[PDB]
Design a protein around this ligand. Structure first.
Ligand code: R0C
Ligand code: R0C
Lengths: 311, 311, 311, 311
């Protein structure tokens, strides 16, 4: 409504979350361990195109799991809900089944878990080599960001692949259970998966991608239709219930917004018909979510009444 | 917007769902088995007070599990979110842990499962006898329905109590795990629980209760504040993710509205800032939800674009 | 072989286990908490009738779970293997399913877990009242002990019943799943169960009961046939794999003898065609087994080569 | 005792089991599918060296899972109980955890499951290449069989490796959880594993290997010490509780002998201080055990009273 006054509250919330110094920076690969715990950035892009940034918003970092809802949207956009959900489920697994790769029907629980993102990766642009598949997804992310920063980290790619024994275990398990479409080169799909995890954004460019999802699939800084209404609706439902790892249920109850976190410390946040946001702070909590970002999200809903069922 | 034209679409959807004759009427007690499979009613109450009914909308039936979100709302209204959630969790259990009474922290998964509703019943109006507790809840349901039909089935009460061995197993298990507030007479709480399950409504009176939840806790036919905004928001989040038994996840994805089903064939449905509805048809599917009601809900969201993340 | 020299090794092992002061005396009821941690007794009865005792062997204590294999033997003796195993399974549950009352077929895992012992109690001497059922089992235990000390603790009975909420949860759960024979008064079976748990023995009398199982069902101090060969064989197989709570698998691997522990600190031990033993020391470890008794059993197999697969 | 008369009962039991035509020959690789359902052989080797064969006892088939207890014995023989069980557990998993690769302590449940056999394979003769490791195990199996038929199927090896996606998923999962000794080439260990599964025996040569285990680790046809008493005792305990897949618990209760089945239809059976046996019939039941072999084992214990706890 009054954008100038709203940005002052964003700056206040940014400053309050800055004092929250807890957490541990992810250190399983040296490309994540490198990062300073003090980096903290918040970028907002409204559905009308209004922008606002505070902090470290032009420093590139990997999307990691923040790419999961984006490639799911691309798959539904090109293939439809029915085809995509023959290979992947549509609900959270719960704390009891959080270590199992598949559900009762031999399908990955949802697109937001590793097994589900690996199957979704196998459905995109079938029939062409990995170079063409990667270019096709980059072309799509550039439209979602309004041609803003979309890069690639080769160091992260080489490190994820050399140390991803758990993902290779998922790959061979999905192959044994017939989870992939026929004629899938599983090892090549894992390569394409590690490449998508290694795509780099800034808070500024990623907030535009979140504002595309908040604006019914239309990029707000170009006015271009990028995703179908069906792809956007399905991505937002699954971000609301499955996007914050084992904290998804607490986040749906207290925050009630579609969001997705990554191991780099990013939280892609969507406020439907209002704005898109990207919070980034490398230190993660026990659940794997950014400590500063989680604090910021709780304060944002309390102050601005953005929760789905807020009156 | 144009109420007259909207009711014609409700009548069309009612007629389309009427042809769906599948399902089985619940028969574990004779009071549920009695019911005709052909009974089918739909009542709408908007947040402005506009009413519309089609079918068997003045035939009383028991709320059964449809009372779970209502007593949860009363508990949060009187005690607050923090106190209530020391005893009960706030998320779905999943298909893996659908037979366990408690979660990792020795708490019932959420207020929408039997163990959770039993603990919530133990928190309401503590310190008084069951007659006063029952009157207090009836007084609250009468305000939610705008003084419309709220009755009681003694036959259902006596039958639920004489055959509820599973609920008695939950009661003793919660007592062993220290799930109740100190000085709780567990057997007396089970009695109060069977009584609340036996409360009778019509489609007409129950649609007013659903419209109270759709209107920020204000009854639309009286203008009286019945529930606090905090109680309404929490009830709607848990109805969205836990309200349709093992179908909750499919319903959140395809329908995306807060709803709650019961073994009598009722589906209490909320469309925030628009209306409240009660669908009722005794035959249930394998998941325990009304066959006609589930069909009606899917058609309603497709036609009127009421899904949470619909643009 | 040379009994005099063998008793000197028993006295040495007794003295070595005496130095092992770890553990905690069970304190859930005051009748168990009363007990001194320093009480330690070992009694041996060979299949030929040779006796030897060291320590506190004439102090009465409750059998508790040590009665589970004894009532199972009585059930198989009177009804046969086929009838008994229509109601109860015949294998360990494992660490994953150690909190579930039933297995995949809606049956208790084995007679050595609480749910299984409750179902076995429901099969003994059906058609008569609890006073006659109790007398019938006492008559049987007196034959197993060669008319040596078999008493009853009323204080333990009243305390087990007043605080056994977990057993009442099992009782109502088994009733819901149709686990009992038709026309079973479940509450009366729980009463009979608490009574059997409260039967008192000494190390001396209990070693005779273990020597009856070691001697093919013939009491070694009377020569009387008490149990059928089929009842003895089935009891010994289930004591070998299910008798030491969550330590059953480690005990089968390192000790390899049929044994059964109880919360009073007793370990009923059988060495087939050699002898029966009862070790008793109130302090229990994290698994619920007597610390001194477990130490003694490990030393006994190492020294005398009694393990099933020892050459 | 009277060998001539005993062989007549073996011939009678062979003839009775021959009429049991149920089951399905394993068909996941063409090398198993090839096999006739009518092949049925029984070979006996006593601890004194007495031999007897009936049926198809000189037709070679792969050991498959029948090699699991043999390589476990070799590992304990060379490294001891303590070192081996730092990497692998010592008990059955149960029906609830029959699809999980690891137990509560991030270790494979026991050496008789695929994950456990893969870890055991990683412990044998470390520091040398796969050709030397394979020769070392062949040298050991030749001593166990008294220099009787021990071959190799290259076709089975190439087929197991090309289609073993589940074993590759186990391999990468064990690598992620740090289950192998440091500096393990996991892919090379999987190769060595597929090679050991492809070793070929006849009923005659395999009954000598089972008689080595029945004779305290001394080969009965040569008198040579092959395995240590500790290796034999540990192998027999784990064959008794974990050797017949999901039927292990029913087999321990009804048969009570150490045994191990394989997908080729073989059942390696040990009667301690009496004899070793190998039953072979390609058609398997739902549990994966040979239909004729299971029938034969039940008849053998009933007739000759060989059950561990038989008087
Ligand atoms: C399907 O048949 C059984 C099955 O469901 N048996 C059950 N036995 N007891 C049950 N419920 C208890 C009541 C309280 N329960 C807990 C425990 C811990 C925490 N909260 N609650 C346990 S369910 C099964 C399926 C699959 C795998 C193994 C077993
Ligand atoms: C906590 O330590 C273990 C534990 O988690 N062990 C695991 N072993 N293997 C695992 N993952 C496999 C990969 C594919 N898996 C399936 C199976 C079936 C369906 N989908 N996926 C199985 S997890 C444990 C905890 C609690 C109780 C028992 C065991």
């Amino acid at each position: 409504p009054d954008f100038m006054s709203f940005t002052s509250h964003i700056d206040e919330l940014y400053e309050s979350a800055k004092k929250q110094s807890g957490g541990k920076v992810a250190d399983y690969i040296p490309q994540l361990a490198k990062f300073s715990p003090d980096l903290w950035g918040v970028s907002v892009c409204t559905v009308d195109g209004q922008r606002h940034s505070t902090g470290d918003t032009k420093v590139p970092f990997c999307l990691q799991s923040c790419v999961k809802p984006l490639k799911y949207a691309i798959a539904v956009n090109d293939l439809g809900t029915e085809y995509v959900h023959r290979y992947v489920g549509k609900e959270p697994s719960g704390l009891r089944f959080n270590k199992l790769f598949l559900n009762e029907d031999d399908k990955p629980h949802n697109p937001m878990v590793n097994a589900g993102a690996i199957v979704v990766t196998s459905l995109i642009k079938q029939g062409v080599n990995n170079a063409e598949k990667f270019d096709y997804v980059m072309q799509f992310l550039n439209k979602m960001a309004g041609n803003e920063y979309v890069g690639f980290s080769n160091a992260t790619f080489q490190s994820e692949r050399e140390s991803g024994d758990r993902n290779f275990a998922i790959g061979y398990y999905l192959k044994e259970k017939k989870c992939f479409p026929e004629g899938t080169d599983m090892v090549g799909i894992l390569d394409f998966y590690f490449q998508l995890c290694s795509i780099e954004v800034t808070c500024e460019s990623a907030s535009v991608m979140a504002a595309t999802l908040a604006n019914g699939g239309f990029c707000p800084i170009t006015g271009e239709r990028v995703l179908s209404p069906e792809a956007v609706r399905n991505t937002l439902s699954l971000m609301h219930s499955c996007g914050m790892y084992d904290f998804s249920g607490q986040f749906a109850f207290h925050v009630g917004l579609p969001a997705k976190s990554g191991v780099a410390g990013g939280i892609l946040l969507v406020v439907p018909n209002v704005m898109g946001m990207m919070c980034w702070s490398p230190p993660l909590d026990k659940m794997g979510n950014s400590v500063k970002g989680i604090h910021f999200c709780h304060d944002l809903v309390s102050l601005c009444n953005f929760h789905n069922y807020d009156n």
